[PDB]
Symmetry: C4
Subunit: 56 residues, 4 copies
């Protein structure tokens, strides 16, 4: 083994570690973005509340 | 095919399979986010509905 | 170049191609999502038009 | 270290570099999307302002 297969293999492993870390970052931001769905539901309630007061 | 070399190759295969699984999770979340699109359009209509009510008053 | 080693190397290449394919799908979805920013700005204008409507009475 | 095997290893490296490059772009797009959080918040305030004007208006 090597000559020098081992060094190349290590480099591949180092790259794989970097991509996975990237994935973790991509997932954190998706989770934060998902909170948007609740906010845009809130806007629709806020508009309905306006409609209720105006009717009154 | 040195045994240690095979061990190392198996590790690489294990890493890639994990990355692919993460990709599935990422795509699943994106599909959910896409539904936002319909929700926003509905808000524009809700405002238009409001405008009509105000005119008829 | 051992025959089994070559096959495992081939298996690795197939996996990278699949991950790359996942990437393109992810990018496509994110481009669609970015269209949201224009839609939200449009809502801000639509609400402002209502305000102009109310002032004129 | 067989020369054919070396090419195949180089090929693997090239694909990984390309995937990382894609990862960067995906991240840049997510950061842009995040600014949406502020925009949706701006709308919530804009609606509240209407309610206040209306109260003074009425
Ligand atoms: Ca990704």
């Amino acid at each position: 083994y090597d000559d020098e297969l081992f060094s190349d293999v290590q480099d591949i492993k180092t790259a794989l570690a970097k991509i996975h870390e990237d994935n973790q970052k991509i997932i954190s931001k998706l989770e934060s973005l998902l909170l948007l769905k609740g906010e845009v539901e809130s806007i629709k309630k806020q508009i309905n509340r306006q409609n209720i007061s105006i009717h009154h």
